[PDB]
Symmetry: none
Subunit: 75 residues, 2 copies
Amino acid sequence: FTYTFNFSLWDDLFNSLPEQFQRMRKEPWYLRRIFRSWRSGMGTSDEAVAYMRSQGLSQKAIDQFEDAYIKYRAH
Amino acid sequence: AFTYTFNFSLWDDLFNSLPEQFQRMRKEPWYLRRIFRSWRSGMGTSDEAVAYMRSQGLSQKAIDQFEDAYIKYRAH
């Protein structure tokens, strides 16, 4: 499974992802590792969103990571 | 800009899923804000909001969290 994200140059400069999210965006094996753990632990969407907001992710970023996870479950 | 993170469980998301317009408010902060600002302008009452949410099949847990979100929105 691979997901290609959709961040603009503006995003990359001024909304830069925290290191662990950047690593998921850039390294498919890590995206998969994290998604697999998340799926195992039965974590909820609202908990995920609350965490990402606390880490300073944009709503755009949150939407894309939620989308990637949805596509990952199906895959 | 005001944001509220809801607290629904996996059980809620599967078996108590929100109607589309409520799901949208839950997932999209700009839409939560749009609706709350319109609600605030229209001077609708709490019992009217609850009556509507009940008719839409929202759980009491959902109703409580949207009421809470609105209270926090008004303060913010």
